[PDB]
Amino acid sequence: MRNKIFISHATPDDNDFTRWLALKLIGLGYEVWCDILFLDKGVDFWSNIEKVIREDTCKFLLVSSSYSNQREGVLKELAVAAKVKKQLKDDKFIIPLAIDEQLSYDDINIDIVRLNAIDFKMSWARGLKDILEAFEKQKVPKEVADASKSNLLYQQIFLHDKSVIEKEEIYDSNWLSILSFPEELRFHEYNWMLPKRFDVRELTFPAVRYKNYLCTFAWAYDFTYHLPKTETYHKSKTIRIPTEEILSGSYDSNFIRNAECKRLIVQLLNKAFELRMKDKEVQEYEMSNKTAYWLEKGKLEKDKFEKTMLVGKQKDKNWHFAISGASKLYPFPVLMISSHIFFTADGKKLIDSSSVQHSSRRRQGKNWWNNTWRTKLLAFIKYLSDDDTSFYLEMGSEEKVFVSNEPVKFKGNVSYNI
Amino acid sequence: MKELIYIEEPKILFAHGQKCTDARDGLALFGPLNNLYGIKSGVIGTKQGLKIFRDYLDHIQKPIYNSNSITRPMFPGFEAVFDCKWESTGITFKEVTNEDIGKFLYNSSTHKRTYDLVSLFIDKIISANKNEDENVDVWFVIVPDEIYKYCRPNSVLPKEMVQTTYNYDAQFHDQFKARLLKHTIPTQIFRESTLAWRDFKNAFGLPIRDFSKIEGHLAWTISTAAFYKAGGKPWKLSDVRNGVCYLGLVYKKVEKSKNPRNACCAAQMFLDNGDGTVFKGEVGPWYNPKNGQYHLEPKEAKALLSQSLQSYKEQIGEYPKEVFIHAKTRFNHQEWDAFLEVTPKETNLVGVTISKTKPLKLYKTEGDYTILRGNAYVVNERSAFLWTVGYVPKIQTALSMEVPNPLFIEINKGEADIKQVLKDILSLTKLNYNACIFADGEPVTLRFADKIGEILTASTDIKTPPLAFKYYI
RNA sequence: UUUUUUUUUUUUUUUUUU
DNA sequence: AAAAAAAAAAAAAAAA
Numbered sequence: 061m062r063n064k065i066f067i068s069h070a071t072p073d074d075n076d077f078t079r080w081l082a083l084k085l086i087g088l089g090y091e092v093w094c095d096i097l098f099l100d101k102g103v104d105f106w107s108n109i110e111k112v113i114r115e116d117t118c119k120f121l122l123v124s125s126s127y128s129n130q131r132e133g134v135l136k137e138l139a140v141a142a143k144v145k146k147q148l149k150d151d152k153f154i155i156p157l158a159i160d161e162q163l164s165y166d167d168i169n170i171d172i173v174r175l176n177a178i179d180f181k182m183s184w185a186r187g188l189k190d191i192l193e194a195f196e197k198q199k200v201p202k203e204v205a206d207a208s209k210s211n212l213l214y215q216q217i218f219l220h221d222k223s224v225i226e227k228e229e230i231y232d233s234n235w236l237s238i239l240s241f242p243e244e245l246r247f248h249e250y251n252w253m254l255p256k257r258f259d260v261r262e263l264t265f266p267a268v269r270y271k272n273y274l275c276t277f278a279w280a281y282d283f284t285y286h287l288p289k290t291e292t293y294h295k296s297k298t299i300r301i302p303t304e305e306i307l308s309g310s311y312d313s314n315f316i317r318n319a320e321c322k323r324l325i326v327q328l329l330n331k332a333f334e335l336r337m338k339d340k341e342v343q344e345y346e347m348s349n350k351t352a353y354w355l356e357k358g359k360l361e362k363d364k365f366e367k368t369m370l371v372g373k374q375k376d377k378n379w380h381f382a383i384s385g386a387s388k389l390y391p392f393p394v395l396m397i398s399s400h401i402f403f404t405a406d407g408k409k410l411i412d413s414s415s416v417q418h419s420s421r422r423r424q425g426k427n428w429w430n431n432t433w434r435t436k437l438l439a440f441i442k443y444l445s446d447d448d449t450s451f452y453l454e455m456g457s458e459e460k461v462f463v464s465n466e467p468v469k470f471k472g473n474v475s476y477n478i
Numbered sequence: 479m480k481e482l483i484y485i486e487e488p489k490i491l492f493a494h495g496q497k498c499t500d501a502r503d504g505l506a507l508f509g510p511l512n513n514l515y516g517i518k519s520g521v522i523g524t525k526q527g528l529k530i531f532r533d534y535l536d537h538i539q540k541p542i543y544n545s546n547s548i549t550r551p552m553f554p555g556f557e558a559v560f561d562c563k564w565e566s567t568g569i570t571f572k573e574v575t576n577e578d579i580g581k582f583l584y585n586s587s588t589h590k591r592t593y594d595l596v597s598l599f600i601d602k603i604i605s606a607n608k609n610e611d612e613n614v615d616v617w618f619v620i621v622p623d624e625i626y627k628y629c630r631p632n633s634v635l636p637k638e639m640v641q642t643t644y645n646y647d648a649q650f651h652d653q654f655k656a657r658l659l660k661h662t663i664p665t666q667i668f669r670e671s672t673l674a675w676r677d678f679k680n681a682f683g684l685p686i687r688d689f690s691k692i693e694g695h696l697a698w699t700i701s702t703a704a705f706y707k708a709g710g711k712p713w714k715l716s717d718v719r720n721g722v723c724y725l726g727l728v729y730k731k732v733e734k735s736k737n738p739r740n741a742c743c744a745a746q747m748f749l750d751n752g753d754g755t756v757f758k759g760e761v762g763p764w765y766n767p768k769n770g771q772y773h774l775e776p777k778e779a780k781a782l783l784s785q786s787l788q789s790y791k792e793q794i795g796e797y798p799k800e801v802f803i804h805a806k807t808r809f810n811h812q813e814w815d816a817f818l819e820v821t822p823k824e825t826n827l828v829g830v831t832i833s834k835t836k837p838l839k840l841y842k843t844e845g846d847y848t849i850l851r852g853n854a855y856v857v858n859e860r861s862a863f864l865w866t867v868g869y870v871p872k873i874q875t876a877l878s879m880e881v882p883n884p885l886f887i888e889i890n891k892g893e894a895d896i897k898q899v900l901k902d903i904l905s906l907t908k909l910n911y912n913a914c915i916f917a918d919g920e921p922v923t924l925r926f927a928d929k930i931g932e933i934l935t936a937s938t939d940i941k942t943p944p945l946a947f948k949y950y951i
Numbered sequence: 952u953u954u955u956u957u958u959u960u961u962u963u964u965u966u967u968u969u
Numbered sequence: 970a971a972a973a974a975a976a977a978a979a980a981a982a983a984a985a
């Protein structure tokens with residue numbers, strides 16, 4: 061028997077209204093046939109359409125729009141519908157649905173120009189109410205309303221082409237693993253030897269004053285130049301600690317606590333990163349809290365490392381890729397790196413106006429996606445490498461910390477495709 | 479390599495028991511949970527500004543097409559989506575003359591001008607509420623852009639255009655929604671630019687706020703807010719277990735009184751006898767002296783958690799079986815000792831801290847697209863990294879512009895299994911009734927709590943504030 | 952303040968050491 | 970008056 065409703069429309073233009081109407085009608089319990097419904101196509105659909113129209117269709121709904129008005133496939137379907145209407149001796153067979161306001165009733169197709177149409181131009185819900193009322197009045201075959209059918213069809217066809225799929229993907233982070241630390245953290249008994257009103261930030265290697273003990277991983281007499289008094293210090297006065305135990309967390313005492321011994325390592329590591337940047341002779345832009353380092357215009361060959369550009373031009377503003385490094389010992393021994401973009405007017409001197417800097421940064425980062433961030437970050441890191449696999453930060457004349465130039469790679473079991 | 483485990487995208491329930499990950503797609507096809515017969519809207523603003531609102535409302539009566547329907551679903555019209563009737567006919571319009579707004583706005587003092595401008599609208603809204611027979615569900619407050627661009631802090635009025643209070647906040651929106659709290663009037667503030675922007679053009683002649691490609695989403699996020707404020711349920715969560723109250727604490731600075739005094743505000747979510755969800759604020763704001771404490775001393779901590787537990791017993795009958803106190807700040811032991819005392823034996827109290835500060839960023843090896851949303855780098859049993867912002871395939875784009883930052887979730891106190899903690903925050907990121915988006919970047923407890931705090935710290939004369947979000951968002 | 956997101960600005964506090 | 974490890978208030982841009 062004829063219990064299917066055929067919806068003709070323009071395939072590449074009227075998908076939204078046709079989708080909404082079909083998904084509503086199916087949920088309401090009306091059998092619906094439409095070309096956007098079935099997923100996949102073959103050569104058979106040309107005969108399938110004709111046989112469905114001539115043998116199964118009970119009502120033929122024509123989406124009337126400026127696109128579907130003079131579309132060849134739509135016109136062919138409409139002609140077959142007219143022939144079926146003649147054969148079935150049912151005048152209320154074709155029910156045009158006008159959804160375009162620019163398509164006046166005086167310019168609709170000749171097959172439709174005589175047919176009363178349901179007005180979807182103003183409100184779609186009013187048109188749907190009219191469709192339902194006309195269907196109950198004309199006693200169209202119907203089933204009990206069930207929105208779950210529409211949900212199933214929507215999930216099967218439309219949320220279907222873009223779904224969670226399983227396939228492993230490797231990820232690149234901005235965390236740089238630390239290969240090694242010195243064996244012991246040294247607490248030098250400088251006392252009166254180191255002046256009380258002296259700054260440790262100018263001293264060569266990283267060293268922070270704790271109580272009366274200078275906290276550093278360096279050797280005792282590494283600090284003779286800035287501290288001439290330290291020539292006659294006794295090395296037995298040091299309270300060197302097994303740093304590996306501190307990282308594990310085993311060591312803790314009245315003299316020093318694991319919380320206050322691990323916060324003194326990150327300061328040393330941060331100052332060591334700053335000193336390495338100073339040694340690398342890369343400039344700095346001072347931010348709210350952190351100090352970020354960017355590379356000049358010309359220090360690199362053609363202002364690019366490897367095949368990847370790090371300094372470029374945006375009108376008169378030369379944008380410079382910048383990084384900032386901070387060490388965190390909580391999860392893993394890690395030197396985290398952040399991405400920053402700064403601008404210069406002449407390629408050497410920074411613009412002091414924060415507003416224009418922020419506006420330029422936003423404008424330039426407008427079009428920088430994942431690959432334009434990862435590539436430049438890893439390029440800067442590789443430029444900072446001391447070897448092919450790692451770079452070291454200097455904490456003494458003999459003590460060094462090896463930080464990998466390869467960011468910590470993670471692993472995901474889920475991904476997708478463009 | 480280090481494993482990252484993906485959490486299934488949560489589903490939000492719609493009418494007829496239907497589930498869908500997307501709010502816009504599910505709502506456009508199945509309709510909202512409850513039947514609102516119609517939105518009798520009240521309009522206040524300039525007579526010139528009423529035309530723009532009428533035009534926009536007539537516009538959203540009709541379907542609105544966005545640039546790429548795959549990226550963002552089209553809007554099929556308010557009545558098609560909501561089964562709720564909303565014309566421009568039947569709006570009660572209260573006229574605000576341009577002379578009135580010019581009288582107060584052109585003043586040297588910013589706080590005084592803001593107070594006068596708020597008073598001008600609130601007096602007419604109150605008079606219409608009290609002495610007019612016409613009933614209005616929600617009051618859409620149209621504000622011009624001159625008032626907007628010179629009625630917030632740090633706005634320096636040019637000398638040539640100056641023509642001529644200090645206890646309140648100089649922000650128009652915060653003070654506006656704070657002073658109406660006693661009257662319980664649901665309101666929605668609109669700028670003339672947020673409305674039909676095409677008239678407003680820059681120096682080049684183009685619109686300043688070009689919403690040409692994002693028109694459908696603009697209609698989606700305006701209509702949903704209007705439906706929510708009128709008493710409608712757009713959607714609900716489906717995967718939340720029984721007996722689980724959540725609560726979210728956020729501390730805001732209060733500058734009107736000497737010392738910031740650090741007011742604390744909370745938002746509460748749970749389930750009902752049946753299947754209905756309750757997302758109501760739980761705010762009694764408990765002020766905390768000292769400049770930067772952000773830690774609530776035991777008396778007011780007890781007050782907060784006792785109010786939270788009683789508001790659950792009063793509606794379900796028995797105490798929550800696992801409270802997940804989310805917060806944006808770390809807990810020191812002082813709150814938790816007090817919290818344990820008021821809690822009974824059966825309740826398993828959990829304090830979870832959520833933070834964006836941690837600088838971890840995943841960059842995928844190849845491709846101009848960011849990490850899939852739902853990946854969780856579990857550091858250990860008590861802490862984890864969760865990417866609530868990122869790529870989800872259905873919306874065709876990432877939720878962010880650059881590589882997104884994950885959420886640092888740490889189970890600071892209680893015990894809690896980390897998987898369930900990561901599986902509820904992701905679910906919470908979907909109930910943002912202020913916006914019709916796929917998902918939020920932060921859980922809505924910490925977001926609606928932040929909003930309700932930002933509104934309740936603008937006026938000092940508030941007492942027993944309303945707990946419904948109609949009056950806050 | 953239709954939203955949401957990402958930065959840049961300051962400021963502040965605590966635990967600690969002199 | 971420093972340090973790190975945690976804190977919120979505020980403004981500007983750009984997409985969703």
Ligand SMILES: NC(=O)c1ccc[n+](C2OC(COP(=O)([O-])OP(=O)(O)OC[C@H]3O[C@H](n4cnc5c(N)ncnc54)[C@H](O)[C@@H]3O)C(O)C2O)c1
Pocket residue numbers: 165166173174175176177178
């Ligand atoms: N309800 C209808 O389908 C319809 C259509 C045309 C005329 N009319 C009638 O018009 C009367 C007198 O008023 P009028 O002269 O202004 O009519 P009219 O032809 O000038 O226009 C009346 C309205 O119906 C028209 N109409 C509705 N559906 C149409 C369609 N599918 N194709 C073409 N036009 C359509 C227009 O919408 C128009 O706004 C009648 O007494 C009457 O029955 C009705």
